[PDB]
Amino acid sequence: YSKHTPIIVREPEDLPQGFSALEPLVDLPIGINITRFQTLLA
Amino acid sequence: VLTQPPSASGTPGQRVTISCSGSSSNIGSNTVNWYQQLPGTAPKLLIYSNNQRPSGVPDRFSGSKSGTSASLAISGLQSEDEADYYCAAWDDSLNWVFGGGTKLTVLGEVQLVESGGGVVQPGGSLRLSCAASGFRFDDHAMHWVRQAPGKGLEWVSVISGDGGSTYYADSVKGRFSISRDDSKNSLYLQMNSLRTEDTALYYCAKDRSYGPPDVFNYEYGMDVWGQGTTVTVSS
Amino acid sequence: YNYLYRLFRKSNLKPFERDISTEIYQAGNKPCNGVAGFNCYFPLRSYSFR
Structure with a gap:
């Protein structure tokens, strides 16, 4: 799921107070036993 | 297993x-045996039949058979108790399954010597000899427990004190021939169909029972071991 | 030899998950290190036909 929402400047970095639903974009099948996750930046 | x-x-x-x-086919129908082996020297019996202990083993060790699994307890361990602990059991399918080992590391008189190793041509092999000195060979059984360098131990074959029925492992069956003689304490084991996967020591272990360890499921054990030869075929 | 057959695994498989394996099984806790010792083989048992 993914959704773009206005995040206009506010108080120091934190999750803003506002409702925003998330619509699905891709539904690719998978069957792996996933139990961990590692992020990555440029 | x-x-x-x-x-x-x-x-x-x-x-x-x-x-x-262990499953009920091996532990649920027999008694587990705990063996202790110091790194470098020959192994030795620690606990047999899960209830009694040999004369050399002190009271610092205890074993229990609650359920289908065995439990060891060493009250007040020290630096001398840093050794390998193996579990062994005779399964009802005519085999002797050993354990894997427990590296319990913490950083703070009859001789049973055998010989007959040496590097040989692959495919074929030679005979494996064994001897002792005054231990009533007729009233005791013998086992072949080989140990690869760095790996664990496993049972190869058994010869009873009576000299009748004998048993081999699941992989050495057929191409192995174990026998004795009416002469002084000795044991012969001829090997055939050498597949080069036999780099071990072939301990000629002494036992205490008389018949094959299949009818006597409460007295079978293993007495003091002996200095084995290092046979390395290496193809 | 064209029809392979895997052997027992110490853990259960997952639905819709391929089980391609080429290592050597380790019975209990004794690593046989490639060379087949006791109770340690490769899970590539070839099916026999006639």
């Missing part, structure tokens, strides 16, 4: 608990 922790841990002064899990 027997499940055993690879390498546990522990601090001096307190006690640990080494366990050995």
Whole structure:
């Protein structure tokens, strides 16, 4: 799921107070036993 | 098949608990045997029949058979108790299944010597000899428990004191011939169809029972071991 | 030899998950290190036909 929402400047970095639903974009099948996750930046 | 922790841990002064899990076909119908082996020297019996201990083994070791698994307890371990612990059991399918070993490491008189090893041509092999000195060979059984360098131990074949029925392992069946003689204490084991996967020591282990360890499921054990030869075929 | 057959595994498989394996099984806790010792083989048992 993914959704773009206005995040206009506010108080120091934190999750803003506002409702925003998330619509699905891709539904690719998978069957792996996933139990961990590692992020990555440029 | 027997499940055993690879390498546990522990601090001096307190006690640990080494366990050995097995199905009802081997442990549920027989008695587990715990063996202790110091790194470098020959192994030795630690606990037999899960209730009694030999004369050399002190009261610092105890074993229990609650359920289908065996439990070891060493009250007040020290630096001298840093050795390999193996579990062994005779399965009802005419075989002797050993454990994997427990590296319980913490950083703070009759001779049974045998010989007959040496590097030989692959495919074929030679005979494996064994001897002793005044131990009533007729009233005791013998086992062949080989140990690869760095690996664990496994049972190869058994000869009873009567000299009748004998048993081999699941892989050495057919191409192995174990026999004795009416002469002084000796044991002959001829090997055939050498597949080069036999780099071990072939311990000629002494036992205490008389018949084959299949009818006597409460007295079978293993007496003091002997200095074995290092046979390395290496193709 | 064209029709392979895997052997027992110490853990249960997952639905819709391929089980391609080429290592050597380790019975209990004794690593046989490639060379087949006791109760340690490769899970590539070839099916026999006639």
